[PDB]
A paper describes a structure:
Previous studies have shown that PlyA binds membranes and is required to recruit the pore-forming MACPF protein PlyB to the membrane surface. PlyA and PlyB together form relatively small and regular pores in liposomes. The membrane attack complex/perforin-like family (MACPF) proteins form the largest superfamily of pore-forming proteins identified to date.
Previous studies suggest that actinoporin-like proteins interact with membranes via one end of the β-sandwich, with the N-terminal sequence responsible for forming the pore. However, PlyA lacks the proposed actinoporin N-terminal transmembrane region consistent with the observation that PlyA binds membranes, but is unable to form pores on its own. However, in the crystal structure of PlyA, we noted two different V-shaped dimers (termed N-dimer and C-dimer) in the asymmetric unit. Both forms fitted adequately into EM density, placing either the PlyA N-terminus (N-dimer) or C-terminus (C-dimer) in proximity to the membrane surface. Also, mutation of Trp 6 (W6E), located in the PlyA N-dimer interface, reduced membrane binding and led to 100-fold lower pore-forming activity.
Residue numbers in the entry: 2 to 136
The structure:
């Protein structure tokens, strides 16, 4: 259902380019900003280079009237280091469960990734701002 939703805002707060790769929704769909009725494909964002002080916004929700939510993964990669993984992200805003998941993993010490705005308890995962900085 549309009630299972997340908005991911990736803001490059550093001075070096970051890139999005392997954007893979596994449940639900991606949609246009402020418009859940307009499906957008992952290819719209796949490989986008986020330059210093730019943002990239991804909107994901459960399919219309479906007893299923939104789940997926993506990577942030370093385009200046042969697309070396920066961090791996996993999101889940499931239908008929009070627990959402937002997991960030990885081991690239040249980067600092901060996130906030998530809601793990009941209803939507919310609007998550992910700030990226290459140290």
């Amino acid at each position: 259902a549309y009630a299972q939703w997340v908005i991911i805002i990736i803001h490059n707060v550093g001075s070096k380019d970051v890139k999005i790769k392997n954007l893979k929704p596994s449940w639900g769909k991606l949609h246009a900003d402020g418009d859940k009725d307009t499906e957008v494909s992952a290819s719209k964002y796949e490989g986008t280079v986020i330059k210093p002080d730019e943002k990239l916004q991804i909107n994901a929700c459960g399919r219309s009237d479906a007893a299923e939510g939104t789940t997926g993964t993506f990577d942030l990669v370093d385009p200046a280091d042969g697309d070396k993984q920066v961090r791996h992200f996993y999101w889940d805003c499931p239908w008929g469960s009070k627990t959402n998941t937002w997991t960030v993993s990885g081991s690239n010490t040249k980067w600092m990734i901060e996130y906030s705005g998530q809601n793990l308890d009941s209803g939507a995962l919310g609007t998550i701002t992910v700030d990226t900085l290459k140290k």
